[PDB]
Structure 1
Amino acid sequence: ELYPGDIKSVLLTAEQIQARIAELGEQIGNDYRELSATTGQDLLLITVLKGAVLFVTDLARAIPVPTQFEFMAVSSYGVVRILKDLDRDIHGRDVLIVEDVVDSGLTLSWLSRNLTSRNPRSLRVCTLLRKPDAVHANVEIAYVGFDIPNDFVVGYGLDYDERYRDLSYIGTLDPRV
């Protein structure tokens, strides 16, 4: 065990995650199958740094169609500041936003509006985890991995002060941390 005592409870084991991603990729693959030959360009996965890097690497390999990578680095104004923009113009591209968790959905709403103004051919959202407050915002999420309670969790990219990211499983963090 990496963090003894810090993990209060195990929410999603590594077995659950990889199995869900396996069938998530198949679903995404089935939907974007008539686009690798109907258009001419591969599915574009856009990921916000950095908690969703573990998920996007497993997902891209789980999707049975060719996929490309694009990353974004953002920070909150203390509406978010762009620390690192995309490398390519996503005009006429099939873009799939890949998130790790959607709670308030504020940044997701911003990102959705920001990418759509770049005029993609298509634009959908895929997240590994969805929290109850994501009902209050509504950005249409076509691909949801898991619906979980409103408890702070870590593991599989998810963090608390840049820690617990390297966990293969997703568990609930102990409040004493």
Structure 2
Amino acid sequence: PACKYDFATSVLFTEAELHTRMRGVAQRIADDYSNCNLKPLENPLVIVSVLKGSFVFTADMVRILGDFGVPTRVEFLCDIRGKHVLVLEDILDTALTLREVVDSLKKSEPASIKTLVAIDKPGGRKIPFTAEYVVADVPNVFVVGYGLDYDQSYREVRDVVILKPSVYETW
């Protein structure tokens, strides 16, 4: 047993560890955008949330950004010309999605574009791509939780965990 979850071989990042890492990222974002005079209504940071599972990351991250004085408005994948855009994704793997999203948003002429991902899987790149902000790295191993799914289940798990091979083989 040892692992808290009967469906996981091991826990990689707890909810608390993820929030701690996300607070470190939020401090950097607060400093990086301090010369942008972000304000609710007049000038929020535009959060563009990409991929269905990212709703969890996105919910926690905007709240933490608020704790740090970075006000936001959210879009899920418009009116962004001259606004700062921060694309959120719960997992960066091949980078094919984020490359397409970033390139498409540039056509709307935002004042700036950066990306922030909860889980970077550098081993999966099919094109070169570096996110400006990375909460945590994961090696080659199939993880679920914190919004990340296996066949639509286990997104609600509060930690990022390694899915036990027996689960997806059988399924």
Q: Which residue of 2 aligns with 1:25?
A: 26
Offset from partner CA, 1:99-141 (integer Å, 9 cap, x none): 1111111111111111111111100000011112355522341
1:34 aligned partner, one-letter code: N
Q: Which residue of 1 aligns with 2:110?
A: 120
The structure that is helix-richer by fraction is 2
Q: Which residue of 2 aligns with 1:70?
A: 75
Per-residue deviation, 1:36: 2.3
Q: Is the contact between residue 128 and residue 145 of structure 1 (CA under 8 Å) also seen in structure 2? A: yes
- Between the aligned partners of 2:51 and 2:89, the Cα distance in structure 1 is 9
Q: Residues 81-96 of structure 1 correspond to what in structure 2 (within 5 A)?
A: 88-96=78-86
Q: Is the contact between residue 156 and residue 170 of structure 1 (CA under 8 Å) also seen in structure 2? A: yes
Q: Which residue of 2 aligns with 1:144?
A: 134
1:51 aligned partner, one-letter code: G
- Between the aligned partners of 2:123 and 2:49, the Cα distance in structure 1 is 21
RMSD (Å), alpha carbons: 1.8
Q: Select which of 141, 164, 170 maps to 1:174.
A: 164
Q: Which runs of 5+ in 2 are unaligned?
A: none
Q: Select which of 42, 57, 60 maps to 1:58.
A: 60
Q: Which residue of 2 aligns with 1:14?
A: 15
Q: Is the contact between residue 153 and residue 172 of structure 1 (CA under 8 Å) also seen in structure 2? A: yes
Per-residue deviation, 1:50: 1.4
Provide TM-score, normalisation by structure 1: 0.83
Q: Is the contact between residue 26 and residue 62 of structure 1 (CA under 8 Å) also seen in structure 2? A: no
Query: Where do 4+ consecutive residues of structure 1 move more than 2 Å?
Result: 132-140
Q: Which residue of 1 aligns with 2:45?
A: 43
Q: Check 1:148–1:17 CA distance in 2 against 1; reply closer, same or farther (3 A cut).
A: same
- Between the aligned partners of 2:136 and 2:99, the Cα distance in structure 1 is 20
Q: Is the contact between residue 124 and residue 142 of structure 1 (CA under 8 Å) also seen in structure 2? A: yes
Aligned residues: 159
Q: Check 1:37–1:11 CA distance in 2 against 1; reply closer, same or farther (3 A cut).
A: closer
- Between the aligned partners of 2:140 and 2:53, the Cα distance in structure 1 is 18
Per-residue deviation, 1:92: 1.1
Provide TM-score, normalisation by structure 2: 0.86
Q: Which runs of 5+ in 1 are unaligned?
A: 73-87
Q: Which residue of 1 aligns with 2:119?
A: 129
